[PDB]
Amino acid sequence: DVAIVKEGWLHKRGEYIKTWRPRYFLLKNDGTFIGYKERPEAPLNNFSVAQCQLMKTERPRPNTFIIRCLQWTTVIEATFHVETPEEREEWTTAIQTVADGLKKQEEEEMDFR
């Protein structure tokens, strides 16, 4: 029963270039977070938000949020900008709710085996 939770345009900072480009992202309730060059082609970005930490910053762009994940030895970061703080709150709340549901599932599978 995997379904889209939230979708929309985000300004994503490149991990390589560090410039900002618009990407159309869809978040699903299983943690899938997929980003396209055009509103729906293979996606340009594809990663799970399970076990992510969300951070907010105002520099260099206001209304920035960062999704940070620790996987083996690597830190994955994804940096996004939206035009208003309200939109940032909408995205970070949606991502956090999905991540929290996945964490509950993880606890039910891993605790007291």
Residue numbers in the entry: 3 to 42, 49 to 121
Task: Provide text from the study.
The Ser/Thr protein kinase Akt1 (termed Akt in the present work) and its paralogs Akt2 and Akt3 serve as key effectors in the PI3-kinase/Akt signaling pathway to regulate cell survival, proliferation, and metabolism by phosphorylating a variety of protein substrates. Akt is a 480 amino acid protein comprised of an N-terminal pleckstrin homology (PH) domain, a central kinase domain, and a regulatory C-tail. Regulation of Akt’s activity involves an autoinhibitory intramolecular interaction between its pleckstrin homology (PH) domain and its kinase domain that can be relieved by C-tail phosphorylation. Akt’s PH domain shows high affinity and selectivity for the phospholipid, phosphatidylinositol 3,4,5-triphosphate (PIP3) using its positively charged basic residues including Lys14, Arg23, Arg25, and perhaps to a limited extent Arg86.
Here, we discover unexpectedly that a single mutation R86A Akt exhibits intensified autoinhibitory features with enhanced PH domain-kinase domain affinity. Despite the NMR HSQC analysis suggesting the possibility of structural perturbations induced by R86A mutation, the X-ray structure of the R86A PH domain revealed very high concordance between the WT and R86A PH domain structures, with an overall RMSD of 0.198 for main chain atoms. The structure of the R86A mutant was determined in the same crystal lattice as the WT protein, and their main chain conformations are essentially identical. In fact, apart from the mutated Arg86 residue, only the side chains of Glu17 and Tyr18 showed significant structural changes in the R86A X-ray structure. By contrast, in the R86A PH domain, the Glu17 side chain rotates away from Ala86 and the side chain of Lys14, and this rearrangement appears to induce an alternate side chain rotamer for Tyr18. Paradoxically, breaking the Arg86-Glu17 hydrogen bond by R86A mutation sharply increases PH domain stability and promotes a Tyr18 rotamer which enhances the binding of the PH domain to the kinase domain. The R86A PH domain displayed an approximately threefold greater binding affinity (KD 37 μM) toward the kinase domain than the WT PH domain (KD 107 μM), supporting the idea that R86A mutation stabilizes the autoinhibited Akt state by promoting the PH-kinase interdomain interaction. Differential scanning fluorimetry revealed that R86A has increased melting temperature (51±1°C) compared to WT PH domain (42±1°C). Notably, these R86A-driven CSPs have a higher magnitude compared to the CSPs due to the interaction with the kinase domain. This supports our hypothesis that the R86A PH domain is preorganized in a rigid, stable, conformation suited for tight inhibitory interaction with the kinase domain.
